[PDB]
Design an enzyme around this catalytic site. Structure first.
Site, PDB file in Angstrom:
ATOM      1  N   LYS B  43       0.324   7.033   9.239  1.00  0.00           N
ATOM      2  CA  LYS B  43       0.149   6.997  10.698  1.00  0.00           C
ATOM      3  C   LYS B  43       1.231   7.800  11.411  1.00  0.00           C
ATOM      4  O   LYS B  43       1.108   8.015  12.580  1.00  0.00           O
ATOM      5  CB  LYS B  43       0.126   5.548  11.219  1.00  0.00           C
ATOM      6  N   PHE B  83       9.113   9.886  -0.292  1.00  0.00           N
ATOM      7  CA  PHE B  83       9.968   9.740  -1.458  1.00  0.00           C
ATOM      8  C   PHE B  83       9.948   8.263  -1.858  1.00  0.00           C
ATOM      9  O   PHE B  83       9.694   7.908  -3.033  1.00  0.00           O
ATOM     10  CB  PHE B  83      11.374  10.295  -1.089  1.00  0.00           C
ATOM     11  N   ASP B  88       8.266   3.784  -5.273  1.00  0.00           N
ATOM     12  CA  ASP B  88       7.878   2.356  -5.213  1.00  0.00           C
ATOM     13  C   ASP B  88       6.525   1.998  -5.855  1.00  0.00           C
ATOM     14  O   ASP B  88       6.382   0.944  -6.496  1.00  0.00           O
ATOM     15  CB  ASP B  88       7.840   1.865  -3.765  1.00  0.00           C
ATOM     16  N   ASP B  92       6.168  -0.578  -8.852  1.00  0.00           N
ATOM     17  CA  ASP B  92       5.251  -1.717  -8.650  1.00  0.00           C
ATOM     18  C   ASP B  92       3.955  -1.612  -9.423  1.00  0.00           C
ATOM     19  O   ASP B  92       3.143  -2.476  -9.285  1.00  0.00           O
ATOM     20  CB  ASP B  92       4.672  -1.701  -7.204  1.00  0.00           C
ATOM     21  N   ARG B  97      -2.766   3.917  -2.231  1.00  0.00           N
ATOM     22  CA  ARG B  97      -1.797   4.206  -1.202  1.00  0.00           C
ATOM     23  C   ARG B  97      -2.512   5.062  -0.178  1.00  0.00           C
ATOM     24  O   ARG B  97      -3.019   6.149  -0.501  1.00  0.00           O
ATOM     25  CB  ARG B  97      -0.663   5.028  -1.815  1.00  0.00           C
ATOM     26  N   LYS B 185      15.826  -2.822   2.939  1.00  0.00           N
ATOM     27  CA  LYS B 185      14.709  -2.080   2.388  1.00  0.00           C
ATOM     28  C   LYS B 185      13.834  -1.420   3.438  1.00  0.00           C
ATOM     29  O   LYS B 185      13.256  -0.317   3.198  1.00  0.00           O
ATOM     30  CB  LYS B 185      13.872  -2.937   1.536  1.00  0.00           C
ATOM     31  N   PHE B 224       8.820  -6.984  12.634  1.00  0.00           N
ATOM     32  CA  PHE B 224       7.772  -6.121  12.193  1.00  0.00           C
ATOM     33  C   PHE B 224       7.377  -6.505  10.766  1.00  0.00           C
ATOM     34  O   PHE B 224       6.207  -6.554  10.413  1.00  0.00           O
ATOM     35  CB  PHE B 224       8.306  -4.670  12.175  1.00  0.00           C
ATOM     36  N   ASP B 228       4.016  -8.288   9.438  1.00  0.00           N
ATOM     37  CA  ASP B 228       3.364  -7.698   8.251  1.00  0.00           C
ATOM     38  C   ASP B 228       2.963  -8.719   7.190  1.00  0.00           C
ATOM     39  O   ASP B 228       1.858  -8.715   6.707  1.00  0.00           O
ATOM     40  CB  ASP B 228       4.301  -6.729   7.565  1.00  0.00           C
ATOM     41  N   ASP B 229       3.894  -9.601   6.854  1.00  0.00           N
ATOM     42  CA  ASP B 229       3.686 -10.646   5.851  1.00  0.00           C
ATOM     43  C   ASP B 229       2.701 -11.690   6.304  1.00  0.00           C
ATOM     44  O   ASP B 229       1.946 -12.227   5.486  1.00  0.00           O
ATOM     45  CB  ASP B 229       5.013 -11.324   5.516  1.00  0.00           C
TER      46      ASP B 229
END
Ligand SMILES: Cc1ccc(-c2sc3ncncc3c2CP(=O)(O)O)cc1
Ligand SMILES: Cc1ccc(-c2sc3ncncc3c2CP(=O)(O)O)cc1
Ligand SMILES: Cc1ccc(-c2sc3ncncc3c2CP(=O)(O)O)cc1
Ligand SMILES: Cc1ccc(-c2sc3ncncc3c2CP(=O)(O)O)cc1
Ligand SMILES: [Cl-]
Ligand SMILES: [Cl-]
Ligand SMILES: [Cl-]
Ligand SMILES: [Cl-]
Lengths: 331, 331
Positions: B43, B83, B88, B92, B97, B185, B224, B228-229
């Site tokens: 975005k 990057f 990540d 993970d 993505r 992070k 934020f 998100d969570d």
């Protein structure tokens, strides 16, 4: 030199102390473990070269703090090295490194090693800041390390495109290409970087001087790697694995220039397999093409050529800066 | 804003042109492919924020070249993002993505993605050099990006120690810890970095101003992520997978503070398994603890608190810098 080496190693403990000062304590503990496993156990030649070159270049601007900065920037070179190695080992699926299990292969590390390697890179600029932020060469050093990282990465990419482990292709393996991989992936950071860093610390920041030093040092890096590839196969042994891994080795490059179409095929069938009778048969094709001898010839010419380079491009740095490296490599 | 967004995106083509100028041509081609796959399709909010903030901060020092530098540094933020994401995803083992196969999962990329991601990082400093080396804030920006990378990495490490995917542990999941992961992070690079960059470009380099802005922006980053969570699980759907992955989610953190010992056990047995009836049963334990409502409460307090922060710490920057971000987030 073996004494300088132990002083260099003894300074590591302090490097680690300063990099490892509430709830991120656990992260910092893991950072320490990463530093300790990965920045120790090499020969320290690249980092030492910073220190040695710094002493030869600078003697009444060598207070304890100047010296401490030289050890530190040497350590920065070793950290950059460590970053590359930890990441390269994962990419190559290597098993061991420096007489131990590769970091990523330690139980419970795995691909978390990617971040650990990023942290090793990051530590370079933390140290530079901590020890050099007030110095006139600070930015010169940040930019040198960044450019070294970029060159090294860009060479790694070239390597990876050239030699995909598990897929035999030898039309990729050209002289021009070999030389391009070595320059970017190896010679810049291994040879130019440490002397360049020492030059900046010493006030020697001119583009022409740096370009002069680079000319010599890149050419040394080319020989050093070429010798590496020769010794990988013909050394007195750590037995190497380059033909097992479809490497773009100086040996294979020469082979391919020097081979009849039948011999091209013998290479097609044996370059890359893990079978020791298959590895036995490229080696023997290299011996049949007298590649130990072309190398011996190559080593002599390369040595002459380096000394011409030093004669021509060293001034006004002390030739000793280059000669000690030439001494080490042409052993 | 949607218009600014398309100008920002249209400038990408030039970014790629300048990063992609003999035998390393093949490497540079692969670099281009890496840029194109990985820096596009988000975005662009972080990079845009640089541009928007730059306009609000600076109007008769906005020549075409000032603007071009702002777009570029915005692009640098997106590259840093890229990057992190590419690396990540590998760590993970993610599959997708940004509506596509993750880069490392493309056939023939694999772990070579580690170097590609290093190249994305490297591109940040190439662009900064190309466009900003003459500017008084150059070094400030190099150091900002390096410090952002370090904070982000150090937080990632904390995350990885806290939430090892495939091994259930909830004694790790503490408020103090959650907050520490988010700050390092996510919030630093996502919120502080872009405004900080814009501040430096605008000449605003004071430690106190930066510390003031940081206070607001880190607190925004905390909300934020918390939002998100929450939305990961309770959003109107991209269905999330946080409980399936033993994440140190704000939801689980609250759960654990608010739970009877029997409920602790219901969490022990279902946090982390892939089975939708097992995922169904944590969700329902979150609903039984009225966590949608604690969140709603949390969102109101957090909003009040941010506006107090802006009141107190924005000056002398235009509050609009912060408010537009608050607007975007508190949607
Ligand atoms: C700057 C620099 C100085 C020395 C080397 C040498 S000398 C040597 N002798 C035996 N085996 C290896 C080497 C190296 C390479 P290394 O320091 O072990 O990676 C490589 C680079
Ligand atoms: C400082 C120093 C640097 C290089 C040498 C070497 S390495 C080499 N390799 C093949 N042929 C000659 C040399 C020399 C010159 P040398 O004949 O050992 O004194 C000797 C001394
Ligand atoms: C600096 C900054 C600006 C905007 C965001 C937002 S607003 C939004 N709305 C719906 N979904 C996501 C977002 C984001 C996060 P994202 O830009 O998609 O990573 C995150 C950071
Ligand atoms: C510029 C701007 C920034 C934030 C708001 C929000 S987000 C929010 N979330 C919960 N409660 C209130 C708000 C407000 C103030 P509002 O009552 O929408 O004008 C409104 C405008
Ligand atoms: Cl001093
Ligand atoms: Cl071991
Ligand atoms: Cl201008
Ligand atoms: Cl796709």
């Amino acid at each position: 030199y073996a004494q300088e080496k132990q002083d260099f190693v003894q300074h590591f403990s302090q490097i680690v102390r300063v990099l490892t000062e509430p709830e991120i304590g656990d992260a910092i503990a893991r950072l320490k473990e990463v530093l300790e496993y990965n920045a120790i156990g090499g020969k320290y030649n690249r980092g030492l070269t910073v220190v040695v070159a710094f002493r030869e270049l600078v003697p009444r601007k060598q207070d304890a703090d100047s010296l401490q900065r030289a050890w530190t920037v040497g350590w920065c070179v070793e950290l950059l090295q460590a970053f590359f190695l930890v990441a390269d080992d994962i990419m190559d699926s290597s098993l061991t490194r420096r007489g131990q299990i590769c970091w990523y292969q330690k139980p419970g590390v795995g691909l978390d090693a990617i971040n650990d390697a990023n942290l090793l890179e990051a530590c370079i600029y933390r140290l530079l800041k901590l020890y050099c932020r007030e110095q006139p060469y600070y930015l010169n050093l940040i930019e040198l390390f960044l450019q070294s990282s970029y060159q090294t990465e860009i060479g790694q990419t070239l390597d990876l495109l050239t030699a995909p482990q598990g897929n035999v292709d030898l039309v990729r393996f050209t002289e021009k290409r070999y030389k391009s991989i070595v320059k970017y992936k190896t010679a810049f950071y291994s040879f130019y970087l440490p002397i360049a860093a020492a030059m900046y610390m010493a006030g020697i920041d001119g583009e022409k001087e740096h370009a002069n030093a680079k000319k010599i040092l890149l050419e040394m890096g080319e020989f050093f790697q070429i010798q590496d590839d020769y010794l990988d196969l013909f050394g007195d042994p750590k037995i190497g694995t380059d033909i097992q891994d479809n490497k773009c080795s100086w040996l294979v490059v020469q082979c391919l220039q020097r081979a009849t179409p039948e011999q091209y095929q013998i290479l097609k069938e044996n370059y890359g397999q893990k079978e020791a009778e298959k590895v036995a048969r490229v080696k023997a094709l290299y011996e049949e093409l007298d590649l130990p001898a072309v190398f011996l010839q190559y080593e002599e010419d390369s040595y002459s050529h380096i000394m011409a380079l030093i004669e021509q491009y060293a001034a006004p740095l002390p030739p000793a800066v280059f000669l000690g490296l030439a001494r080490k490599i042409y052993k």
